[PDB]
């Protein structure tokens, strides 16, 4: 059923170049990967400070090609399975396009991947903005971010 996700990326008003993605399933499974295809030279100051230093070391198997990350996710999301998939992100318009561009144009998205991501901030506001935990130390690590989204969703829906 439900997956909470986050991405880091380099975006220049034209393209969204994916750095990393973290996805946590409501059932407890977690996926994290760092693309070996983004060019770190194209990173702006803010990404260079806040995103790049938090990445795994280069010898880590967490570093995957774009094709591997897409295949990992088709497996992780159970694209062939019983369940309806619901994707959730916090202020995730760009995150949604970064995710979907792992398959290509929106035309190429597998049939069972939803064409919209539910917006966790919208849910939170619709429930009167209940108090959240303070943001983690390691924000801008996408897996840390994704785990925190699930934590919030659980708090919001209790």
Binding residue positions for Mg(2+): 6
CB atoms near residue 72 (< 10 Å): 17
Please, which contacts does 130-133 make with residues 24 or more away whose CB atoms are closer than 8 Å?
130/155, 130/156
Site string for Mg ion, 2-21 (x = CB under 5 A): ----x---------------
For residue 66, the partner it binds in Mg ion, its own copies, none, with Cβ less than 5 to 8 A by kind, is: Mg ion
Q: Are 31 and 117 in contact (CB under 8 A)?
A: no
CA pair distance 7, 142, nearest whole angstrom: 5
- Chain positions contacting its own copies, by CB under 8 A: 11-16, 44, 91-94, 96-97, 100-101, 103-108, 115-119, 121-123, 126
Q: Which is nearer to its own copies, 61 or 157 (by Cβ)?
A: 157
> What is the size of the binding site for Mg ion (CB under 5 A)?
6
Kind of pairing between the strands at 2-11 and 86-89: parallel
Contacts to Mg ion by CB under 5 A: 6, 65-67, 142, 145
């Amino acid at each position: 059923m439900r997956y909470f996700y986050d991405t880091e990326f380099i975006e220049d008003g034209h393209t969204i170049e994916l750095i990393s993605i973290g996805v946590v399933a409501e059932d407890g499974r977690e996926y994290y990967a760092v693309s070996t295809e983004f060019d770190p030279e194209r990173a702006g100051s803010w990404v260079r400070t806040h995103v790049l230093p938090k990445l795994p070391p280069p010898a880590s198997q967490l570093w995957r090609s774009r094709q591997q990350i897409r295949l990992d996710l088709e497996e992780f999301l159970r694209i062939d399975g019983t369940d309806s998939i619901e994707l959730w992100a916090w202020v995730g318009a760009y995150d949604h396009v970064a995710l979907c561009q792992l398959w290509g144009p929106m035309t190429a998205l597998p049939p069972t991947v939803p064409r919209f991501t539910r917006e966790l901030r919208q849910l939170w506001e619709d429930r009167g903005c209940p108090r959240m935990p303070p943001r983690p130390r390691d924000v801008h690590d996408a897996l840390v971010d994704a785990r925190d989204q699930l934590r919030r969703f659980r708090l919001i829906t209790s």
